[PDB]
Design a protein around this ligand. Sequence first.
Ligand SMILES: Nc1ncnc2c1ncn2[C@@H]1O[C@H](COP(=O)(O)OP(=O)(O)O)[C@@H](O)[C@H]1O
Ligand SMILES: [K+]
Ligand SMILES: [Mg+2]
Ligand SMILES: [Mg+2]
Length: 299
Amino acid sequence: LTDLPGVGPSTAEKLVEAGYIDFMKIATATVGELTDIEGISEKAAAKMIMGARDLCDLGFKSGIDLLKQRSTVWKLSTSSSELDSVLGGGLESQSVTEFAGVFGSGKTQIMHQSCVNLQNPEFLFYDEEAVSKGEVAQPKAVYIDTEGTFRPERIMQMAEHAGIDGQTVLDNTFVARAYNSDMQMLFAEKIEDLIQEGNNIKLVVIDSLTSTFRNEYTGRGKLAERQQKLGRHMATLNKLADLFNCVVLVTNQVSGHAATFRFFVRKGKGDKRVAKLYDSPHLPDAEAIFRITEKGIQD
Ligand SMILES: Nc1ncnc2c1ncn2[C@@H]1O[C@H](COP(=O)(O)OP(=O)(O)O)[C@@H](O)[C@H]1O
Ligand SMILES: [K+]
Ligand SMILES: [Mg+2]
Ligand SMILES: [Mg+2]
């Protein structure tokens, strides 16, 4: 931290204590967040912010540097060939992907499968030139369970069928049971702490994203307040995805969100499932057919 312009030993101590230990967090911080630290003037705040941005080279970029930036994005396999393809490779880090659908369509299944695949190193697709092995080593997932449907037995089962130790997935997956939107949101904000503690969080799951908000703000005469809270939550999720080069997945029960990728999943004939990608910044709307078996997501 003392590398930052104006930052001396005492200021560094105040920053680390306030949770600002990383440069990108300071570079992307507002003078407000830092002046709130007290002891941190708006003067020092502005200088260290400018210096962090510069140290992180956050200016204008063009040409080949645009490709290099896009290359820091790694993708997580869904275990479904059709789905991975419709995704343009797999689930993207640095973005929030939403899986919406009626009850029983398979949203929770995809969340579980994703926690398992994170542990199969060959399921993380990346350009070693832009993403080092160290960056994706010992990856851990965070599962914010809003419904109480997290099933450790299901994790074990999927893991085993994929040839991976079930307990190893459990050992590297943090589950947080949230009973309301307040807990749901705090948990997500506290993910930054798991990382500061040495945990390489590479996958964040929110299952589900909207249940709590809907039960708390049913009155469609306050839907604005709800939308406001949900908006702040989503913003926290997108920033988390970006700053920590992390894959973020959310589910939504249906009978629009700030998610960069949005799917509609419906149950097909028996085993079959159809995921329709209807929203993304660079992919065409397309459907992927797959199935859910005792092995998890397959085909
Ligand atoms: N162990 C299993 N073996 C085969 N299919 C399973 C297994 N566990 C769950 N499923 C399938 O997952 C479906 C439920 O998926 P789920 O993700 O919970 O739906 P939702 O979108 O409401 O969260 C079941 O109804 C069942 O067909
Ligand atoms: K300094
Ligand atoms: Mg992003
Ligand atoms: Mg579910």
